[PDB]
Design a protein around this ligand. Structure first.
Ligand SMILES: [Mg+2]
Ligand SMILES: [Mg+2]
Ligand SMILES: [Mg+2]
Ligand SMILES: [Mg+2]
Ligand SMILES: [Mg+2]
Ligand SMILES: [Mg+2]
Ligand SMILES: [Mg+2]
Ligand SMILES: [Mg+2]
Ligand SMILES: [Mg+2]
Lengths: 141, 185, 75, 62, 142, 66, 100, 144
RNA sequence: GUUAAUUCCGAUAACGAACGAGACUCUGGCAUGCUAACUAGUUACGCGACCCCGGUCGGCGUAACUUCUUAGAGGGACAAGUGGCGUUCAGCCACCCGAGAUUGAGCAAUAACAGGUCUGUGAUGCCCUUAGAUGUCCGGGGCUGCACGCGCGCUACACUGACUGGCUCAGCGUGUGCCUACCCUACGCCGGCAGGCGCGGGUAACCCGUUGAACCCCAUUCGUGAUGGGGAUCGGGGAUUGCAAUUAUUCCCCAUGAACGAGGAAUUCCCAGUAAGUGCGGGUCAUAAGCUUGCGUUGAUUAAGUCCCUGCCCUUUGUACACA
């Protein structure tokens, strides 16, 4: 009886995103390659298939803590913005990426717009992430 | 539990300090055998508590130098770990014996001071301090603007100094200091 | 005051070279490999990876800042 | 010309133009009869061993 | 049978770790995660020092669940290590005889005192005229 | 620098003869003596007075104090 | 019957005295209450430069103004509680009654 | 694989500019003026060039495919906000200027401002700072 | 003789005193002992979701309880125990037990400066001007101007690194206004970003907020090339604030890609959760931090000394000095 908590989280996201690629039911956006992930960043993501990871990462985050809205997702993925000859600061992520990712994980039944705002993990979507932890846990062993 | 071994890989036993002059100022043995080169602290509170700090810890603390990496213990700990790995597979025995031998051969035994300068000998504690200082600064300068990583620069500096080959930076400073001191005698 | 001219891809004079004595080094690392063969750092990483698969060098440690290789045990 | 090593018997005081060198008297373990006074640079306890490159010159008292 | 519970806390700079030790079959888990999967992984033997220095047979029969809040990455590491050691001592004190706490407490201290006694060091305030507690701005005589 | 100021020394030198029969040998018992037998504005000053009185008694045993 | 009273005052010595009295002032009339609960102390800080002129060493003032907050609650109708809080109020302490 | 190809070209000539073949393709084509560290990356993704390949490794059809994309950005789903000459004054056309075109275009804008004797034109003529920053103690070594 | 101390012991033509120091206030540490907690929580219970009896659940509700959170009262540490040094006094060193055997600030004497402030004041003497005003208001410009010299800082010169992903940790503290316009923000849609549009909470341990902060950590690409280091300068475009932004307020996008390869003589700050790295709040704020003032995080090398340099305190001594 394994669970997302009990398995290594670093390669858990790698396996969960590859499952989404095999499904082919995510409805990726059309500017996936010409967009920059956040203003504090400097280049486009090196891997072309980042959208499968970004969807996977948010789906993992919604498991640990529910009720995370779009304004939460931009704060979770923010980082240090180097401002030239200015001291660096903290800059939030992009809203559009979070919105389309959350709308992506809702198109197929993985999340739902629960009350009080934000999104939570649906009971059937919870099964999917628990199935992945099964194969990741045994693969290391 | 017995046989506390560094990193869970290197055994602290079978390490022998040949020079009795610095025996009590190098902490390798059973009372100071720890799984990690990381420790809480409280070693600078009094004058001689420094000698009860494990020697591998004292080397890690001598690697957070030159501004860019003050107070970065995690990066320094992993540097020593990788350096100890490649000292073993390049020399063939426990790196603790390599590090200890370098300390013995690198700490200068005589210096000069303003009292024209007079030649005075060095106390055992400062001999340890100078050794760790010299061994680390050699690795730092050998890795700056160079392709090879900081880990192997630290590895060969310990290896070269242990054999006393004179091609290491630490030894080139020791004989310099002892040759100047002799001329000031 | 000195300039390094490191190639990016093996010549046929060079690929056959590191299949002879590189699997015989005690210490194998992209940094040390680069300076003996005068090749780019990335080139050594890609080459040392292929030799790893063939089983002629065994991996002892792997970190984002350094990967370390040894040679196969004698006999 | 061999090299001798000796142990300090007590700490006499702090000397030097800037208080950076200590006078202590050393006692050879090779010979338990001969003791001399020497300057030493660095923090020194009582009973530790000093490596004497040459052990023929005596340090004047302060 | 009766519930065998004791809840002890651990301290560091600001991080605190309260551990609920009950009677079980040898379970250890932090925030719902095991000890080995605790970031950063480079500081892993710091968590494993009390268990390795005592063995699993002493941790058999109990379950530990440590929850943490505050401090930093390294500060927490020294808080979980603080609570698990203190929890085992406070268990053998109340539900096991005194002869079992003593040799446990001897072993823990002689490895390091700070494994059962908190560290009083705390950050100190910043004074005006300097970037920190004791540093001062550059003098500009001319 | 643990040097007793005249305020701590004077109170101890006055308390001690008025209550030599009550004041004893240990610090904790005569800490309780001073709290009620004389008004002390603060704890930290009471401890210093009581501590010096304890030190004074041991001197009295060997020989008279001037 | 659920009524809650708030006690906010700068002085911490006096605020407890009124707090202590009303717990006694309620328990005497055998009506159950929930104990004195204390909100975290609020510190107000105004850091300013000492000198009105320009020169001098750069010196600053550390002003503070603490606010201590207390809550007590009663299960009683309005007619009893009006006269409870109308007697023996320290001038520093202020009392405000609310109905849940 | 890791052996030098027989067709490897150490210097490529695109848009009257030398390109270092020993460099990665994404960063090598940055050599021509008008393309940066990001516009180069999207161009090589609007088309299908293996980013891992170095500049001197890809075929001549592949490079001539790349050149056409750059000079006609709007024809291949390049967003309009990703250009450096959006909504110009001459033809109102959102275009991408490259190599000598960027140098020629800049010099015309500088003489355009001086044509009407605007303030920024005069500052450029006098060789001073134009964006309102202080010139009391900065930018000294250039001005003798 | 002693102390951090004109702090004490003690000598004594002095006796008894006064301020300052110390005492004192706040703050840090630690108390499973006390008082409490639906604006703080824990444990058990009963559900429910998921994995295969157990496990996870900041998903829900409830019976005790106060360890974690909060805030009050008391406690606790005193050179008190022990061993040496000492006129055997004042006291000092070390060790045992201990949370702790020097936490950090605040306040702070007599005398003086011709130190700064008349641009803080309806604090003010005297002098000047007062209707073509040195009063007050309105429009525009300047206080930013650039052959140069100086000071406080920020960003850098790279691999102990940069970039792209993933992973995981805080603490102080603010928030809708007397005039007075001007608050903090959750959620959902629109956009690539800056942002815009509907909707709710909060006068606050109630909501933003479990403040998902950086550094750090793991995995990629780069490979010693002024290069994917560095981001100055300059062109084009889009928003927000404001009655008005041009001499670009600020923000965002593309492109442009300078010096800089560790810094001469010289000089500053610092010794323990300290230096340094790192980010986050208040102040200034219509628009708003390279500054200051606070907070946490990661966390050292060296040293327990001296009067050599710069100065300070007491005694003796010389003086042709006394705005010294
Ligand atoms: Mg983040
Ligand atoms: Mg290097
Ligand atoms: Mg004056
Ligand atoms: Mg004047
Ligand atoms: Mg006149
Ligand atoms: Mg000005
Ligand atoms: Mg460059
Ligand atoms: Mg860059
Ligand atoms: Mg004379």
């Amino acid at each position: 009886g394994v669970t997302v908590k009990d398995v290594n989280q670093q390669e858990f996201v790698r396996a969960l995103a590859a499952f989404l690629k095999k499904s082919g039911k995510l409805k990726v956006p059309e500017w996936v390659d010409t967009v920059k992930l956040a203003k504090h960043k400097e280049l486009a993501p090196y891997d072309e298939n980042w959208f499968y990871t970004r969807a996977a990462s948010t789906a993992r985050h919604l498991y640990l803590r529910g009720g995370a809205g779009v304004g939460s997702m931009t704060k979770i993925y923010g980082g240090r913005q180097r401002n030239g000859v200015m001291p660096s600061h903290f800059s939030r992520g992009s809203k559009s990426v979070a919105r389309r990712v959350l709308q992506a994980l809702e198109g197929l039944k993985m999340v739902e717009k629960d009350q009080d705002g934000g999104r939570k993990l649906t009971p059937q979507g919870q099964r999917d992430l628990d199935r992945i932890a099964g194969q990741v846990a045994a693969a290391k062993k | 539990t017995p046989d506390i071994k560094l990193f869970g890989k290197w055994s602290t036993d079978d390490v022998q300090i040949n020079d009795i002059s610095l025996q009590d100022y190098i902490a390798v043995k059973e009372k100071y055998a720890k799984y990690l080169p990381h420790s809480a602290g409280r070693y600078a509170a009094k004058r001689f508590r420094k000698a009860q700090c494990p020697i591998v810890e004292r080397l890690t603390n001598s690697m957070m130098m030159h501004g860019r990496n003050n107070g970065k213990k995690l990066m320094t700990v992993r540097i020593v770990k990788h350096a100890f790995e490649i000292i073993h597979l390049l020399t063939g025995e426990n790196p603790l014996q390599v590090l200890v031998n370098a300390i013995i051969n690198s700490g200068p035994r005589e210096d000069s001071t303003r009292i024209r300068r007079q030649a005075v000998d060095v106390s055992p504690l400062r001999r340890v301090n100078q050794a760790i200082w010299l061994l680390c600064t050699g690795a730092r300068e050998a890795a700056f603007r160079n392709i090879k990583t900081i880990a192997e620069c630290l590895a060969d500096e310990l290896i070269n100094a242990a054999k006393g080959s004179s091609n290491s930076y630490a030894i080139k400073k020791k004989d310099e200091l002892e040759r100047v001191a002799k001329s000031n005698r | 005051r000195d300039k390094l001219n490191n190639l990016v891809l093996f010549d046929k004079a060079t690929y056959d070279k590191l299949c002879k004595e590189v699997p015989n080094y005690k210490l194998i690392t992209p940094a040390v490999v680069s300076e003996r063969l005068k090749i780019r750092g990335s080139l050594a990483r890609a080459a040392l990876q292929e030799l790893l698969s063939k089983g002629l060098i065994k991996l002892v440690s792997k970190h984002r800042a350094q990967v370390i290789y040894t040679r196969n045990t004698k006999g | 010309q061999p090299i001798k090593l000796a142990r300090v018997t007590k700490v006499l005081g702090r000397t030097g133009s800037q208080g950076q060198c200590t006078q202590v008297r050393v006692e050879f373990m090779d010979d338990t009869s001969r003791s001399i006074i020497r300057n030493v640079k660095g923090p020194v306890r009582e009973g530790d061993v000093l490596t004497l490159l040459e052990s023929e010159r005596e340090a004047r008292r302060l | 049978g009766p519930l065998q519970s004791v809840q002890v806390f651990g301290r560091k700079k600001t991080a605190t770790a309260v551990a609920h030790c009950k009677r079980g079959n040898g379970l250890i888990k932090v925030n719902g995660r095991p000890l080995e999967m605790i970031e950063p992984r480079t500081l892993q033997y710091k968590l494993l020092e009390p268990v390795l220095l005592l063995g699993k047979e002493r941790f058999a029969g109990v379950d530990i669940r440590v929850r943490v809040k505050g401090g930093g990455h390294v500060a927490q590491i020294y808080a979980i290590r603080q609570s698990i050691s203190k929890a085992l001592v406070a268990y053998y004190q109340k539900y096991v005889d005194e002869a079992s706490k003593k040799e446990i407490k001897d072993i823990l201290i002689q490895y390091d005192r700070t494994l059962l006694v908190a560290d009083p060091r705390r950050c100190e305030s910043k004074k005006f005229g300097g970037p920190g507690a004791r540093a001062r701005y550059q003098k500009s005589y001319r | 620098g643990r040097v007793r100021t005249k305020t701590v020394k004077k109170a101890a030198r006055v308390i001690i003869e008025k209550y030599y029969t009550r004041l004893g040998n240990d610090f904790h018992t005569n800490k309780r003596v001073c709290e009620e037998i004389a008004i002390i504005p603060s704890k930290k000053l009471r401890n210093k007075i009581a501590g010096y009185v304890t030190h004074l008694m041991k001197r009295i045993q060997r020989g008279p104090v001037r | 019957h659920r009524i809650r009273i708030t006690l906010t005052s700068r002085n911490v010595k006096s605020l407890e005295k009124v707090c202590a009295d009303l717990i006694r002032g309620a328990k005497e009339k055998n009506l159950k209450v929930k104990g004195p609960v204390r909100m975290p102390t609020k510190t107000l800080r105004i850091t300013t430069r000492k000198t009105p002129c320009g020169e001098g060493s750069k010196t600053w003032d550390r002003f503070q103004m603490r606010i201590h907050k207390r809550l007590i609650d009663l299960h009683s109708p309005s007619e009893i509680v009006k006269q409870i809080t109308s007697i023996s109020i320290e001038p520093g302490v202020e009392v405000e009654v609310t109905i849940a | 694989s890791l052996v030098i190809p027989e067709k490897f070209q150490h210097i490529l000539r695109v848009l009257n500019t030398n390109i270092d073949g020993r460099r990665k393709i994404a960063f090598a084509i940055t050599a021509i003026k008008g393309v940066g560290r990001r516009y180069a990356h999207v161009v090589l993704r609007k088309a299908d060039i293996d980013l891992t390949k170095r500049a001197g490794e890809l075929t001549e059809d592949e490079v001539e495919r790349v050149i056409t994309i750059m000079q006609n950005p709007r024809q291949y789903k390049i967003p309009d906000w990703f250009l450096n000459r959006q909504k110009d004054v001459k033809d109102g056309k959102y275009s991408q200027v490259l190599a000598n075109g960027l140098d020629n275009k800049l010099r015309e804008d500088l003489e355009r401002l001086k044509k009407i004797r605007a303030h920024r034109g005069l500052r450029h003529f006098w060789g001073l700072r134009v964006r309102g920053q202080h010139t009391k103690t900065t930018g000294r070594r250039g001005r003798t």
